[PDB]
Design a protein around this ligand. Structure first.
Ligand SMILES: Nc1ncnc2c1ncn2[C@@H]1O[C@H](COP(=O)(O)OP(=O)(O)OP(=O)(O)O)[C@@H](O)[C@H]1O
Ligand SMILES: Nc1ncnc2c1ncn2[C@@H]1O[C@H](COP(=O)(O)OP(=O)(O)O)[C@@H](O)[C@H]1O
Ligand SMILES: [Mg+2]
Lengths: 40, 209, 52, 40, 142, 51, 378, 53
């Protein structure tokens, strides 16, 4: 059984949806606000 | 066929011509025991989640005693008037039936009616008619009563802390009793009714006059 | 000394003066000492309500 | 009488409708159970 | 088995079947008495008394040969004494609970009487149930 | 009537039950009205104080 | 001995994951590691650490003393069974198999603990063994073994009240429910903060206070915040010792929105540093932002966007890309206008969003019994 | 002790008559509620904002 020939060769999901919207959007917000205190 | 439950020992204190007109104010000078039995019976009947939440093991049955004419029947009359729960009021020397079996079935159907009916209250008076000390297995008039005590001694153990069924028992002489009835898990709270003092006494003079 | 009943009066007077002079937790402490003292007297006939 | 106190201390927090037993309920109880020691 | 319930047909009284196992006269007895079952974990500061009672009760079951190493007879009687409210009942219950013996107190009551005998003119009729639950301990009050 | 006992013979048991049934039947849980009891003895010493 | 044992694993985190931070953690981790007989748990922490070439005698002296404790257990068992107490072999290793639990790995713990579980006929030792299994399953994050002894614990919480074994347990359900992202259960297990105690694992009670406020500020709405955490004296006096956190809570409740970002980057930054939070700090403040947007924005309908920069927190285009990514994220119920420079809101009925989660769970369980229906019958 | 609780009682009764007069309508101008309470406008606007918060 399961011969299956070879043509080719939580803990994880809510963090993955945070990666879905938020994969790489500013990462470390710590000084952008203080860079907008003088511009804004 | 299965049956809806039945008992004849008592119905349920029919609630119209049944509540003896007796106010709490009719009893003067019993501030310890009135508030104390208020803690004992109906306060776990209402505020059950405090006894469960702090978890202080509310009493199953209560015993009350003393010299005669200290308001033993009277306090049960007033509590029976001001209760909201159902109330079962039996006369404690009627389980001695002529036929066998009518006694023990007469025991168990009362607690079946208290079980099925409501979070209710059992009252029993003259327990000295049943709970004696000595026995004699040569009459049948004694063996019957022996079985009567063994029934309710089984049945009080047949509870689970979840049913709100309280047993109030009042006698005259605590001496002629088996302490096997007074074991914990069955009886814990004991209330003597001491003779009126000169302080509570005046109050009774004020209320009666 | 021998007395118990006058201690209820002076502790209850402390319960007057610490809240009247705005020291709330010490007033709760002295009030508590008035409770656990006043439990042991057979006759507080008016000092009961005075504490109440 | 130790258990006579410690069982009783819940009645004070219950009669003031607490849900947590406080230390002053215990000394409120010792003055009752030892008053019963003072009784005869 | 002797002292067992049965089913029974009625027309010829032919023996039909064998129901449950009824109940041992001692289990009913302790069910009536209802000793407050206990353990070592609810003992308050009685450890030297625990070390005493282990020597008299605990040892001559687990090691009966150990007294034959010393040629002395095993003890049989224990007297406990002190004021009431001092853990006598929970101690004697607890030791039997941990050594696994049938804790049987006698009270001389008469509700107990029907499970001992019809009259039981002695006290000695208890010994049938005692040696029937042979690793057992007999308890008494004042 | 009787006083009470510390439970001597087997006969006095149910007579005390009869007596306590009478006691509860007098003034337990009843407007005992229009019904008057008249009693008599040669010695009022062998009686229950509850009676 | 597992009572100081959590700081060890927290410092394994602090050694491993902040890659710049690799000096004092391998100092004090060594300080506790090559003393008190710790032998097994640092070979791959030594792989993450340096060579530490001469560890060999340091190993041999400590497995030597471990051999001494092992062989005196082996001196204990035969006199233990010789004149017998309460099976004094397992009465010995019900104290010293926890020594073997710290010192040896989880196996010499577990077979001795499931071993010794059948000895103590009262729960007063059983449930403590279960607490030990809870703690080591917390260490190796044995997420299935915790599900066992949680319920197996709770089965022994009935008989008796045992509120030093129930309220104590609620701390463990709270720490696991904050290990996972279960916040509304986590503050609910962090309800009491009264019967909670000067514990071994949060030796600062105030660290527990910071944890329950950090989870509670998401987990409950204003009605509760305006009764529970604002009027609790026992919760108030311990944040009275906190300058930042008392400001951090009251900036939100007192509608101080601009400094709320300033304290927010502090709390989020420390949460980024924090062990057992560090899995979900990126989930935390993205909820805090949209929650703060909900609190201010659900007051008005015709609030402009150019009010929020100076009044709320600076950066107009940041508010633009932020808000959008949230209307685009299907929450934050409003509809922003652009070329007249105003933000307009709506109110949604609880009929479409309440429908949405039902089609989520319905399609999920349909996938579930669909899959198991494929599993059975081949 | 009376002077202690008059402020919180004033807040309670302020909100009681406050929700009394907000009742009968669908929408209104805040000048009419400031006049009908006979009170200012900024305090009423902030306090109603606290109500909807
Ligand atoms: N406040 C009071 N306290 C005590 N007794 C009172 C009070 N008011 C009236 N009584 C009188 O006391 C009697 C109490 O009746 P009750 O039947 O309860 O007595 P008892 O204690 O049950 O005695 P017994 O068991 O012999 O009947 C009443 O007949 C009544 O006349
Ligand atoms: N050392 C103790 N630890 C816990 N409870 C005790 C202790 N000593 C006495 N008690 C309490 O005393 C009661 C038992 O009294 P005991 O001495 O066993 O019987 P008696 O008082 O009839 O001799 C129990 O309710 C128990 O809780
Ligand atoms: Mg009466």
């Amino acid at each position: 059984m399961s011969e299956k020939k070879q043509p080719v060769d939580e803990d994880n999901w809510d963090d993955d949806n945070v990666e879905d919207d938020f994969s790489n959007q500013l990462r470390a917000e710590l000084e952008k606000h203080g860079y907008k205190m003088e511009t804004s | 066929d299965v049956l809806p439950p039945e008992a004849d020992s008592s119905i349920m204190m029919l609630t119209s011509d049944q509540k003896p007109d007796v106010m709490y104010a009719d009893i003067g000078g019993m501030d310890i025991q009135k508030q104390e039995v208020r803690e004992a019976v109906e306060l776990p009947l209402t505020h059950f989640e405090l006894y469960k939440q702090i978890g202080i093991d509310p009493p199953r049955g209560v015993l009350m005693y003393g010299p005669p004419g200290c308001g033993k029947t009277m306090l049960a009359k007033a509590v029976a008037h001001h209760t909201t729960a159902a109330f079962i009021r039996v006369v404690g020397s009627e389980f001695v039936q002529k036929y066998l079996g009518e006694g023990p079935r007469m025991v168990r159907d009362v607690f079946r009616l208290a079980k099925e009916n409501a979070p209710a209250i059992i009252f029993i008076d003259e327990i000295d008619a049943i709970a004696t000390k000595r026995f004699d297995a040569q009459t049948g008039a004694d063996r019957e009563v022996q079985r009567i005590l063994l029934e309710l001694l089984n049945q009080m153990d047949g509870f689970d802390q979840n049913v709100n069924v309280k047993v109030i028992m009042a006698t005259n002489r605590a001496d002629t009793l088996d302490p096997a009835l007074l074991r914990p898990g069955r009886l814990d709270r004991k209330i003597e009714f001491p003779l009126p003092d000169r302080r509570q006494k005046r109050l009774i003079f004020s209320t009666i006059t | 000394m021998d007395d118990k009943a006058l201690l209820v009066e002076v502790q209850l007077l402390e319960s007057k003066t610490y809240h009247a002079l705005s020291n709330l937790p010490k007033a709760r402490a002295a009030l508590t000492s008035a409770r656990t003292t006043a439990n042991a007297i057979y006759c507080p006939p008016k000092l009961q309500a005075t504490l109440d | 009488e130790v258990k006579g106190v410690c069982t009783e201390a819940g009645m004070y927090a219950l009669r003031e409708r607490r849900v947590h037993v406080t230390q002053e309920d215990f000394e409120m109880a010792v003055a009752k159970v030892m008053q019963k020691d003072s009784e005869k | 088995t002797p002292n067992c319930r049965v089913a029974l047909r009625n027309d010829s009284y032919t023996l039909h079947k064998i129901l449950p196992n009824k109940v041992d006269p001692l289990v009913s007895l302790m069910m009536v008495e209802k000793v407050p079952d206990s353990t070592y974990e609810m003992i308050g500061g009685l450890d030297k008394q625990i070390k005493e009672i282990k020597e008299v009760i605990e040892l001559p079951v687990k090691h009966p040969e150990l007294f034959e190493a010393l040629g002395i007879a095993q003890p049989k009687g224990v007297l406990l004494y002190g004021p009431p409210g001092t853990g006598k009942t929970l101690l004697a219950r607890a030791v039997a609970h941990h050594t696994d013996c049938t804790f049987i107190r006698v009270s001389g009551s008469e509700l107990v009487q029907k499970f001992i005998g019809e009259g039981a003119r002695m006290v000695r009729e208890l010994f049938v149930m005692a040696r029937e639950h042979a690793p057992s301990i007999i308890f008494m009050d004042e | 009537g009787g006083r009470r006992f510390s439970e001597g013979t087997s006969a006095d048991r149910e007579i005390q039950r009869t007596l306590m049934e009478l006691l509860n039947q007098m003034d337990g849980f009843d407007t005992l009205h229009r019904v008057k009891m008249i009693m008599a003895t040669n010695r009022p010493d062998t009686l229950d104080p509850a009676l | 001995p597992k009572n100081p044992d959590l700081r060890i694993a927290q410092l394994r985190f602090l050694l491993s994951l902040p890659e710049h931070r690799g000096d004092a953690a391998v100092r004090d981790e060594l300080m506790a590691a090559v003393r008190d007989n710790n032998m097994a748990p640092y070979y791959e922490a030594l792989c993450k650490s340096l060579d530490w070439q001469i560890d060999v005698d340091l190993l041999n002296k400590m497995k030597k003393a471990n051999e001494d404790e092992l062989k005196r257990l082996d001196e204990e068992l035969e006199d233990a069974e010789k004149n017998l107490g309460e099976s004094e072999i397992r009465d010995a290793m019900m104290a010293k198999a926890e020594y073997l639990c710290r010192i040896g790995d989880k196996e010499g713990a577990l077979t001795a603990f499931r071993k010794t579980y059948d000895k103590t006929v009262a729960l007063g030792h059983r449930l403590d063994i279960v607490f030990y299994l809870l703690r080591i399953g917390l260490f190796y994050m044995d997420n299935d073994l915790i599900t066992r002894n949680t319920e197996k614990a709770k089965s022994l919480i009935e008989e008796g009240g045992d509120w030093d074994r129930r309220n104590r347990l609620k701390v463990y359900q709270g720490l696991y429910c904050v290990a996972i992202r279960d916040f509304k259960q986590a503050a609910e297990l962090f309800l009491d903060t009264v019967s909670t105690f000067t514990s071994y694992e949060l030796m600062d009670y105030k660290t527990f206070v910071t944890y329950t406020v950090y989870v509670s500020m998401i987990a409950l709405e204003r009605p509760d915040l305006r009764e529970k955490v604002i009027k609790g004296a026992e919760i108030l006096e311990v944040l009275h010792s906190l300058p930042a956190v008392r400001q951090y809570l009251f900036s939100l409740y007192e509608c101080r929105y601009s400094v709320f970002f300033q304290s927010l980057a502090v709390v989020e930054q420390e949460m980024k540093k924090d062990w057992l939070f560090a899995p979900h700090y990126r989930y935390y403040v993205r909820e805090m932002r949209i929650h703060a947007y909900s609190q201010l924005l659900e007051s008005y309908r015709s609030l402009t966007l150019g009010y929020m920069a100076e009044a709320f927190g600076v950066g107009v285009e940041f508010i633009d890309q932020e808000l959008s990514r949230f209307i685009a994220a299907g929450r934050l119920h409003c509809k922003i206008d652009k070329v007249n420079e105003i933000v307009e809101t709506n109110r949604p009925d609880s009929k479409n969003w309440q429908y949405q989660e039902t089609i989520k769970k319905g399609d999920l369980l349909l996938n579930r019994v669909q899959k198991l229906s494929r599993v059975i019958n081949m | 002790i009376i002077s202690t609780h008059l402020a919180k009682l004033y807040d309670n009764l302020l909100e009681q008559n406050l929700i009394r007069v907000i009742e009968p309508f669908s929408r209104v101008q805040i000048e009419h509620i400031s006049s009908l309470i006979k009170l200012s406008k900024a305090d009423v606007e902030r306090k109603l904002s606290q109500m909807i918060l």
